[PDB]
Enzyme design. Sequence first.
Site, PDB file in Angstrom:
ATOM      1  N   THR A 160     -12.926   7.272 -28.814  1.00 25.62           N
ATOM      2  CA  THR A 160     -11.706   7.429 -27.977  1.00 25.62           C
ATOM      3  C   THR A 160     -10.779   6.256 -28.214  1.00 25.62           C
ATOM      4  O   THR A 160     -10.901   5.213 -27.579  1.00 25.62           O
ATOM      5  CB  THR A 160     -12.029   7.513 -26.479  1.00 25.62           C
ATOM      6  OG1 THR A 160     -13.066   8.474 -26.256  1.00 25.62           O
ATOM      7  CG2 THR A 160     -10.794   7.926 -25.703  1.00 25.62           C
ATOM      8  N   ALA A 211     -12.763  12.948 -19.766  1.00 21.46           N
ATOM      9  CA  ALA A 211     -12.043  14.078 -20.333  1.00 21.46           C
ATOM     10  C   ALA A 211     -11.551  14.997 -19.229  1.00 21.46           C
ATOM     11  O   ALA A 211     -10.362  15.331 -19.167  1.00 21.46           O
ATOM     12  CB  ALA A 211     -12.933  14.849 -21.312  1.00 21.46           C
TER      13      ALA A 211
END
EC number: 3.4.25.1
Lengths: 199, 213, 238, 116, 220, 199, 130, 201, 217, 204
Positions: H1, H49
């Site tokens: 990420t 998420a």
Amino acid sequence: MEYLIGIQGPDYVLVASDRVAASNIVQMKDDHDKMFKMSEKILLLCVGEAGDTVQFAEYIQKNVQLYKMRNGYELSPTAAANFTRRNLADCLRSRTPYHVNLLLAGYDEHEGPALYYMDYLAALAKAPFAAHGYGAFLTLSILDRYYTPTISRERAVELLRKCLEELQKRFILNLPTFSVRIIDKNGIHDLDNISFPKQ
Amino acid sequence: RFSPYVFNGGTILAIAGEDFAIVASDTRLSEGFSIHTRDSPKCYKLTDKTVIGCSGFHGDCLTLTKIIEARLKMYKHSNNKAMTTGAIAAMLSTILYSRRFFPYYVYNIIGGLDEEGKGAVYSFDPVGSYQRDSFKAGGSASAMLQPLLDNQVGFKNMQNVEHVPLSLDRAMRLVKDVFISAAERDVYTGDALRICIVTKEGIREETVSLRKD
Amino acid sequence: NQYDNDVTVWSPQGRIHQIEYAMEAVKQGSATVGLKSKTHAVLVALKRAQSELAAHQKKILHVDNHIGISIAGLTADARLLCNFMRQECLDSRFVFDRPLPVSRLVSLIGSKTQIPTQRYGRRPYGVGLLIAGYDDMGPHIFQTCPSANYFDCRAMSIGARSQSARTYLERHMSEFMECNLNELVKHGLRALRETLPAEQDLTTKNVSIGIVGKDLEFTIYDDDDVSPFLEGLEERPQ
Amino acid sequence: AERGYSFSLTTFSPSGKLVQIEYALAAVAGGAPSVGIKAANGVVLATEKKQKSILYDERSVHKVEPITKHIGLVYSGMGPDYRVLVHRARKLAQQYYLVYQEPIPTAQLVQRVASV
Amino acid sequence: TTIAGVVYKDGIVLGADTRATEGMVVADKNCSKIHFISPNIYCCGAGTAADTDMTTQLISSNLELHSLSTGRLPRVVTANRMLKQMLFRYQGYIGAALVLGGVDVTGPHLYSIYPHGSTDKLPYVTMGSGSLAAMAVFEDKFRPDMEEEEAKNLVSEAIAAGIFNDLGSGSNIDLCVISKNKLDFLRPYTVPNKKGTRLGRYRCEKGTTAVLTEKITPLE
Amino acid sequence: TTIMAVQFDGGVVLGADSRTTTGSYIANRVTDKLTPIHDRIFCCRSGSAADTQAVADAVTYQLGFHSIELNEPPLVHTAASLFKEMCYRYREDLMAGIIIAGWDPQEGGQVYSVPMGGMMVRQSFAIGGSGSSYIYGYVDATYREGMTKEECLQFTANALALAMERDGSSGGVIRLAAIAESGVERQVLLGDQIPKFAV
Amino acid sequence: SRRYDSRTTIFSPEGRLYQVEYAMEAIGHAGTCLGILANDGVLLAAERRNIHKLLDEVFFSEKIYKLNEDMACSVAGITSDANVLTNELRLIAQRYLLQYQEPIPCEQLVTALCDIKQAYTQFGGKRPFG
Amino acid sequence: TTTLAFKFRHGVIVAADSRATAGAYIASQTVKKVIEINPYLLGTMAGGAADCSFWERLLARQCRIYELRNKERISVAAASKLLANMVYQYKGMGLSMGTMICGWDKRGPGLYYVDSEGNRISGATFSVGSGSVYAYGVMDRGYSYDLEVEQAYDLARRAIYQATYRDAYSGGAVNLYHVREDGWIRVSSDNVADLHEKYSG
Amino acid sequence: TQNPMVTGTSVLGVKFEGGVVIAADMLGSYGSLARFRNISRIMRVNNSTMLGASGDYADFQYLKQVLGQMVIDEELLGDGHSYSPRAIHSWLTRAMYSRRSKMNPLWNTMVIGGYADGESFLGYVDMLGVAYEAPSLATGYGAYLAQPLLREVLEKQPVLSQTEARDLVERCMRVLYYRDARSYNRFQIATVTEKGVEIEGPLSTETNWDIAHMISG
Amino acid sequence: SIMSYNGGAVMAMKGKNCVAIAADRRFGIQAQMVTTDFQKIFPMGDRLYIGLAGLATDVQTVAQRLKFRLNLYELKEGRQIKPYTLMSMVANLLYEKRFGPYYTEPVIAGLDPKTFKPFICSLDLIGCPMVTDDFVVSGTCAEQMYGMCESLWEPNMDPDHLFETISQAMLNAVDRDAVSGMGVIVHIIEKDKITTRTLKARMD
């Protein structure tokens, strides 16, 4: 933690902060300003918890600007200073406590300059000069040495250069620059940034 | 003291062809070290072209099925049509997220035909996020099955090979193999296996036998 | 004239005016018939248009996969009582995993429309229902009123000029038990054709048929699904 | 059951009068005579007791009530409305005595009973 | 704290010490542990000082309001229910521990109330820190029914064992004698010990200490 | 503490002992743990002393209100069901072993046990408290179906006498109560009347 | 019910508020009360409306209330309503003091009361403060 | 990420990897990380998420209501202060949410960084996520305010490529976005395996 | 209910041809002490369903009131419907599942066997809202002792006779009584056929300790 | 506790027609001293001083929320407050916050407006009233001042002897405490006048 400092002259209040917004080991921003004009003659420097300062500055700034428009005559600094403390003390015992530390510097027409100090517990107290953050421990000694009740705006920036040059030497944080402002009978003027060339 | 979850195993899997959508899951429902029952499909037909696969904590599968199967009717009365797969996937996300501070514990694999008439598969996590995929396995053997599809269906780490689309014949015989190979090494997969093929003509169900060990 | 401004006042005669009136809201509504067999229940409704360029308002509202209704009265009230039934039948799937049996559904409408005929300044729901459902007792029809009564019928009609239908249905009530599906709908149409003026007839753009049976979840037919039932229909001569 | 009405029944008239209070003062003037006389070391509250047979027990009710160790009431007018005010006064006195630990001054008690 | 009560043929004798400690430092050397509830129901409070004060005053008001309305004496039973059901609705965070005596139109009663709302009707009770010392002296020299003067002597002599043998108890002994016709609320009743006299003048005068400012302000 | 209720044909025989421990200090050595709930229904409170008292009072309040609205002498099974409802709703806060037993005008004597959880079950003889543990044998061998009121008042005496020699939280005097259609015959055993088993 | 409703918060056909207009006429009967400003202070004069030989005086004034340390006011109209408005004023002016820690400005104290007098004429269906 | 965004003379470059993990195990290697809020705001997604998808999507609903009432697109400055207030009411509830609102305004290109902890700072360079520290390096040596639009696409790739190469919870494809004055354009979708053969030799 | 107090143990159930048969021992145990020797852990829910509870006995009596009043209420309408076994079973799932979202659960496990429409039916309900039908069940410690004997037999042939079942369940109670510490000697067998719900009173089990002489030799 | 977090001292002392209440001045955040002058004594009418030591926040809330009850009582009633009531009134205010208390402990010095009888008292942080006739202390140096005053007091003193005693009693008790000192102020109240002197203490 960050760093505020105010010095209350005999006809003006000199405030300075650092300009860093760090999260983790990196500095996100380097021009990040902590002063929130609440009027023509009232600065509220916040600092402390990440989220609380931005919420609790907007919330005070938006009841002091209300109060100027409803009635017509801005608050005193003595008034606004007690108005903050109240709000900060009433959120001390509830779900959401605002963990902030403040400096409220302002210049009244009849009672002169005033520089207030706020613990995050919300213990108000007027002073002649105060500091926050870990840098407080290094500079409160330098202000005691050299600060007298009568001191011209020139000697004050020269006194503030010492405090912010100490932080460069002994302190472990990076703090490259410092926004400086000054309040008097004319309003809020920005002076030049005390800055330290590392390039 | 009281623990509101338990992990009831179950493995779910889904391949999106090009005019067909597989959704295949074992049936063994187990808790702890006992085997509660040997048959109990993890596959519930929602519309005529949408299967959803729940696997995980079986108390929440039942709730999360009846909730979707209701907000499926509710939608139909107000809009006078059935929902598309593309919509259910979005709706299910909100439902899941509604309980963000005591979450469901359900891995969801939706598979059906979106509008154009193509295979579509959506993968959810517990707290409700989803992308669209071409195959996802989930549940317990999710780590057994995910590399044998990356290879056969994804051709990843191969070279000098065809890429001719996925045949409805090569899929089913692919599924039947990977499940026979997860039943050797995983202890939550076995007993039976519902393969749901979802073509444009309805939904067939084929039952195959795994090893009962 | 002072006993007409609330449901809360009785009349010296021993009625309530506000409840009588509400039922005139039903006789303003568009004719509709309902009859049954022993395997099918049918709702035949005569839609209506308020212009030449305009569609016709839907008389048959789908409730669940074994319950239909046919409204007649304020439509805003008919969709307030339809959402409550849709909600009662999603409460049953979700708790008992069965279809809500119709007799126990009409008893909830009965408990919820009773209430506001006895509180201050609330009104009765200005809509009458015909409820065609099929469960574990064969077919049912149920007529609901704004008064909050209801009835188990073998073949009922409400709306405007409904009396003309009620007689047609009362002469043929014996034949209904032995009909196949297509023969029944013929009766319903022939009864609904006696509610029109004598000058016009049933077309495909203002008839709505609803069938529920033993093996057939409640459906609705419009436009050109209605043509296999008007074609073959007797001629009604004057 | 009910909710309760919300709209005041005491209303101004074209005169500038509150007719309801004007009438409730005429009820007062139907009631049994009562006199009050401040002395110079005591107060006397005397009242014409009500009875209209020899069957009544003239010691089962009292038109002279004690509100506190240092307070008293008599009244003139409707007898049910008097037991309501005597009872809201005795509670006012007890909230006052519960916060200051001091018997409620008499200027105070009248100023609160009046606001009820 | 030690508090104690006894039932003798005429009425009640409630005994308290008078030392109240904030920790291991004596804060007050005179502390009224015996609270007026009604004209014929006195009450001793041990445990958290600030709890009994505000518990007893609250009952006194629900009970001096309940006396006007009946128009007669309030009963000891009634104080024993109000205390009991107010304390049980606070699950025991109100740390009061009470000895509620009183003389009724049904004979004298005496009650223990414990924090959690347990009430126990006995003929002689002890509460508080040194209580156990007291309860020793009762369990030796109690006879049911005795003179008015054997009770006063007994109960002081029990508070006395509390005082000498326990910490947090000390200074004066308070007695309260309730009877169906009098009420001799004594305060003190015994000074079991008093501090001696200083052996010099350790204070000074006329400008002992420096000043920096003097502002005088006159009033009217 | 130990409490005991036995059922014979005319009525029931309750038996408790008096001693409220608070750790290892005894607070009250002559406690009355046979509380009248009505005119011929008694409860035996054990477990937390302050919890039971509250519950008992609350059931009297409802049960007496309930008998005047029917104009009938309430049933024992009724005053049981009310403890059952009470102890089950608040099975977090409380901790109350009850033993309702009384004489009914239409089911005989009855004994209902209501243990910590809020279960309810009828029993020939019940037995509860902290010292009950120590007499489940003696009470299981010696009880035989069918007794007279004079074989029971000596039975519970012997039981509660064993339970006081061994338990630490039991002692003092024994309180029995025979409840029959006649009335209630309360007696106290103390000193030598308390049976003895020393060996 | 609706029969017994006065409808005190509703317009006239003419464009007035009848209850607020009558309340004026009720003030035309109270005692005279005048005030004069100067440069060196300001003063209220009011005539005692109630006077008698038996009537007593216990309070520094029977019409002048002190709302603060710095403000007093005189009332006129229904005396009963005046014991209510003067208690909200005092409570307003301390609630100001409790925040800003100053004595409240003269103008604000009034408007803050006139939000309460004005509320009553616009909704709720109570009779206004006369 | 690893998402990074930097504002230069011809607009804003948003760059994102796409590997998203469920532990030491890699769940999917294609999770979009940049969220098409509008057709003139880009969000990112770097904490949980679930949480960044759900709130950014909820921001898109707010900014499309705002559009209809006022009859003018919403400021980038304004849409970051709206997303701060939604999330500051859950402070300490345990969200994660490292998002960046990028867009073009009445005051030019702007770029804000919003946090789960109540931070709202405009700037000119950001990096958020597991790899963010690796990006700040390679990005701040080649960054100028004045670049050509072809150099800036390369700098972003190179700075995401270098973040995935050191970091473990970073990888997969490199998505690249360009906020120009009229609306954003999806520049390219590369792969780390192909950028490895272009930059090694 | 955070902690169970009085608690029964184990409920066997097995299908056969035209009926279901439940067993359960009559002991409610309060810790180790076997304290209430004659409780019934069979309920009769209307006349074609029955219900065996393991778990906290006080919570089982709190269904027995709810099911009671929830069944009476269908027969007051007398409209010709009932609650099936298939329904009563669902309804308990929701019962537990919701008490499990207040973090305040019913602490029962439950076997609910019934017979309606020529078809048998045997459900299970956990304190977590787990639920499922099988052809054999065993709550609690029978999940590892009786379950393998009941499932061994239903592999050979899935059909059983009224005589094969009641023998198979009286031969699995012998296993618990040997190897389970909370079992008792008196259990109740309950059966539904289409003649209703017949509940047999306390039945003993004859055990052999012939292996008590092989411990030395 | 957390009443140590700021430190503080107060001390009242009865004379024979006068009363003197003394306090330290030092607002410090743990060990770090911020300001040398921070008032812990407040006027509550004339000849009535409340002294609040402990947590510096509640020192300021409780003197503000006590001024709001007091003013709203000297208006609503014309009398001026009695020193015995200002004790009961500030008892109730603390006990209002029973659970999650304030962290101050009031000290009240004062004379009865209608005579000149002296009156002092302290309170616990939960609101228990303790009327004494010697002297009352509260703070973090409480035990320092108890010992110091018990042998430095006399049953009757004039206005010149009192100010001698409490002065030399505060200076020595507050110098033996870390988190107090740096300036003592002493009010001393007669019937006539209110003299207020600051003592010269050790600024360390």
